[PDB]
């Protein structure tokens, strides 16, 4: 069927919560955290059974007063392909997750 | 100081008689894509001062420009995704992970880094066959 953004968006939000929810920023775990987010997000996406090849990215930055900025541009079939991006934030870090669905 | 950590991983299997496979000369070439990306970053960002308020639109400008450059590289039958990440130089750095469920025999990716006095940038580009 189709790439349902709110369906993907809730998957992303729960994956972020499962991985870093309730944790303050630790330098010793940040790379492990980004990997955990994309691992969970992709696994929950593949379980939908839809005919897509997925790209999932997670970006984490410690909060210092400095900002974090992202954007994506694609060259695909907009009638079939889609994307979802969630910007998550707590008292100590930013986390931005982008999931792209490319139909086959 | 500025710390940047970028990683990549692929899920097992290929999402789903005959198959089509890309011809070598038209494949998504990471080495070529890198050289296009760094040329774009060098020209657009070289050392020009950017305020923090200019950065949100700057990312879209770079992503669109990089995407348009890649469209003229002869990569036939490839859908392409370009993600651009920018942080202000005052920050400690940025960390990023990418994971794909695709065809590891046909699809490929690039990670690239640029920095100047105002900002540091990370570019991730992906090419999926067919």
Author numbering:
A (entry chain A): 10 to 113
B (entry chain B): 2 to 17, 28 to 141
Quote the passages of the study that discuss this structure, keeping the authors' original sentences:
Dynein-2 is a large multiprotein complex that powers retrograde intraflagellar transport (IFT) of cargoes within cilia/flagella, but the molecular mechanism underlying this function is still emerging. Dynein-2 is the essential motor for retrograde intraflagellar transport (IFT), the conserved process in which polymeric IFT “trains” translocate cargoes along the ciliary microtubules. A 3.9 Å resolution structure shows how WDR34 and WDR60 use surprisingly different interactions to engage equivalent sites of the two heavy chains.
At the base, there is an additional density in the cryo-EM map that likely corresponds to DYNLT1/DYNLT2B, but which is too weak to permit model building. Previous data show that DYNLT1 and DYNLT2B interact, making a heterodimer the most plausible stoichiometry, but a dimer of dimers has not been ruled out. We therefore purified the DYNLT1-DYNLT2B complex, used SEC-MALS to show it is a heterodimer (mass of 28.1 kDa), and determined its structure at 2 Å resolution using X-ray crystallography. The structure reveals a domain-swapped heterodimer that accounts for the unfilled density in the cryo-EM map. We then used AlphaFold (AF) Multimer to generate a high-confidence prediction of the regions of WDR34 and WDR60 that interact with the DYNLT1-DYNLT2B heterodimer. In this model, WDR34 residues P37-S50 bind an edge strand of DYNLT1, whereas WDR60 residues D469–P512 bind an edge strand of DYNLT2B, bend through 90 degrees, and form an α-helix that wraps around DYNLT1-DYNLT2B. The DYNLT1-DYNLT2B-binding region of WDR60 is in precise agreement with that mapped biochemically, providing experimental validation for the model. The N-proximal region of WDR60 wraps around the DYNLT1-DYNLT2B heterodimer, providing an explanation of why the binding site is large relative to other DYNLT-binding proteins that interact with one face only.
